[PDB]
A paper describes a structure:
In addition to the anti-TNF activity attributed to the N-terminal four cysteine-rich domains (CRDs) homologous to host TNF receptors, CrmB and CrmD have anti-chemokine activity attributed to a unique C-terminal extension (∼160 aa), named as the SECRET domain (smallpox virus-encoded chemokine receptor). Here we report the crystal structures of the SECRET domain of CrmD encoded by an ECTV strain and the complex of it with chemokine CX3CL1.
To directly elucidate the chemokine binding by the SECRET domain, we reconstituted a complex of the SECRET domain with the chemokine domain of CX3CL1 and determined its structure at a resolution of 2.6 Å. In the complex, one SECRET domain monomer binds one CX3CL1 monomer, displaying a 1∶1 stoichiometry. The SECRET domain contacts the CX3CL1 with its β-sheet I, burying a surface of ∼530 Å2. The SECRET domain contacting residues are from the strands 1, 5, and 6 of β-sheet I and the C-terminal extended loop, while the CX3CL1 contacting residues are from the N-loop, 310 helix, 40s loop, and the β3 strand. The binding interface can be described as a small hydrophobic core surrounded by a large halo of hydrophilic interactions. The hydrophobic core is composed of residues Y212 and F225 from CrmD, and I19, L23 and F49 from CX3CL1. It suggests that although the SECRET domain does not directly block the most important receptor binding site on CX3CL1 (i.e. the N-termini and critical hydrophobic residues of the N-loop), its binding is still close to the receptor binding site and bring steric hindrance to prevent efficient interaction with the receptor, which would provide a structural basis for the ability of the SECRET domain to inhibit CX3CL1 and CCL25 induced cell migration.
Author numbering:
A (entry chain A): 161 to 318
B (entry chain B): 8 to 73
Amino acid sequence: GSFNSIDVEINMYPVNKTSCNSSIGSSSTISTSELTITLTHEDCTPVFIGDYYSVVDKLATSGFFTNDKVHQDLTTQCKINLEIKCNSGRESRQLTPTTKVYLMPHSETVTVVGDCLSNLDVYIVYANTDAIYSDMDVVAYHTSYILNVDHIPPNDCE
Amino acid sequence: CNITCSKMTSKIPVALLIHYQQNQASCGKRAIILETRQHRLFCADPKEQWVKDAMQHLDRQAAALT
């Protein structure tokens, strides 16, 4: 039941700003002038080492990633909080994922502030890269139709 | 040709990259193919330092795997 790697993938539509500012720290953020994404985690052993954000048209992908050099301590429970805030917002509801069973321990919360996205997918990927076959828990949220972002490269912020 | 190099990709975090390959002369632009953790391919331009370092990095990983 262990894992050693976490990925967060956020796809959004439609978005207008492309210049972006990012930070990995106790509070991890990806910011444009129209959007703010914030990641806090707690008791998570794998370490986040960067984030990304790339847009094609008004279609964007973005997210946060750890390396895979360390496994999750199984005596504590990794907790992932993700907030997606419109700079033009007020109402702050959280989100419900596709139901499903998981082989690894973790908790996650996705909060959304604002109404500026027609489309929003959010994937949290807990992965055990010490597996022979693909060994990933995938917690998925959708607010409408599932966007395709293959073909959009995960560029760093700029 | 599974891929033909139109636009080149701008900087991708070296941590997200898992493989690179020389692209066929026949395929498209004679450039480098990059593979990401998400199982995706993008065409990069070998002259940029970033791509160069990326390559020396994956090269470093492939050795070690041996």
